[PDB]
Amino acid sequence: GSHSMRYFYTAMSRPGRGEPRFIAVGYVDDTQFVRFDSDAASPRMAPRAPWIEQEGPEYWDRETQKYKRQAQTDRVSLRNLRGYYNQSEAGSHTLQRMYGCDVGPDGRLLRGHDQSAYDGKDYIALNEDLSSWTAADTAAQITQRKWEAAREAEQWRAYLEGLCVEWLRRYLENGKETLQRADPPKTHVTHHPISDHEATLRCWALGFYPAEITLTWQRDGEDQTQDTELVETRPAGDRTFQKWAAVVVPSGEEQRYTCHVQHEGLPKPLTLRW
Ligand code: NA
Numbered sequence: 001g002s003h004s005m006r007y008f009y010t011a012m013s014r015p016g017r018g019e020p021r022f023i024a025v026g027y028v029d030d031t032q033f034v035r036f037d038s039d040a041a042s043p044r045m046a047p048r049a050p051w052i053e054q055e056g057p058e059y060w061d062r063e064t065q066k067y068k069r070q071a072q073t074d075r076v077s078l079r080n081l082r083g084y085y086n087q088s089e090a091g092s093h094t095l096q097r098m099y100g101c102d103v104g105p106d107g108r109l110l111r112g113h114d115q116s117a118y119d120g121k122d123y124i125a126l127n128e129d130l131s132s133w134t135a136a137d138t139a140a141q142i143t144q145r146k147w148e149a150a151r152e153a154e155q156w157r158a159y160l161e162g163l164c165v166e167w168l169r170r171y172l173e174n175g176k177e178t179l180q181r182a183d184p185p186k187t188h189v190t191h192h193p194i195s196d197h198e199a200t201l202r203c204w205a206l207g208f209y210p211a212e213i214t215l216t217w218q219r220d221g222e223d224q225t226q227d228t229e230l231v232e233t234r235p236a237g238d239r240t241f242q243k244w245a246a247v248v249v250p251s252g253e254e255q256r257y258t259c260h261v262q263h264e265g266l267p268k269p270l271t272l273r274w
């Protein structure tokens with residue numbers, strides 16, 4: 001029922017080679033819908049989902065200019081940051097930002113987000129109040145003061161409560177056939193002896209969307225929390241996801257074990273066995 005829009009910006013300096021590279025990607029839930037890359041050839045902003053290709057040239061040009069303005073801003077930021085940390089003019093550095101809005105099933109704002117990081121560590125974050133900042137270190141207190149003076153949080157609040165939510169609603173409607181349809185997992189259980197007295201049971205989930213999923217193993221109905229091995233959820237490359245969970249069991253006791261699969265695309269969870 002609930003949904004999110006999120007942007008992910010990365011700016012990477014390369015002093016003496018060129019201006020910093022700026023790349024942005026945007027998502028609705030777990031679906032990417034846009035990329036901008038200052039280093040790409042032609043064109044620099046590309047659509048990544050079909051429902052976005054429905055938008056017209058005014059929309060595209062508007063977004064393009066926002067990306068171009070941000071790339072310039074990020075160049076100033078990276079310069080300022082090397083000063084803040086008394087760094088050499090020679091090393092490469094990375095500035096990241098992640099922002100967006102979460103809405104409930106009624107399309108109403110649940111909460112907004114904006115966060116930045118420098119060289120992979122938290123730098124400054126908008127608090128959930130959309131009115132104040134958390135500086136992660138002493139240097140980020142510089143930005144905090146500058147942004148307080150500029151009433152930067154007020155601009156964020158206006159965006160997060162307004163256009164962020166409005167546009168997310170629009171994308172969800174235009175993209176409803178995919179964005180609002182959960183694809184349940186395709187499942188199976190496999191068996192792999194590790195010796196003649198123990199064997200691995202592996203419970204698979206393939207082809208599911210969104211990425212959130214819960215795979216568990218039980219022995220006679222008791223959860224095997226501490227003895228289940230999970231791989232990280234991984235992308236299939238076609239917008240769907242994959243995961244597996246494994247337990248190692250005494251040979252000949254396989255019948256005691258059940259795999260349980262919970263996913264938004266499954267009205268009732270699945271129970272699977274070897
Ligand atoms: Na707004």
Ligand code: NA
Nearest residue numbers: 185186187270
């Ligand atoms: Na299945």
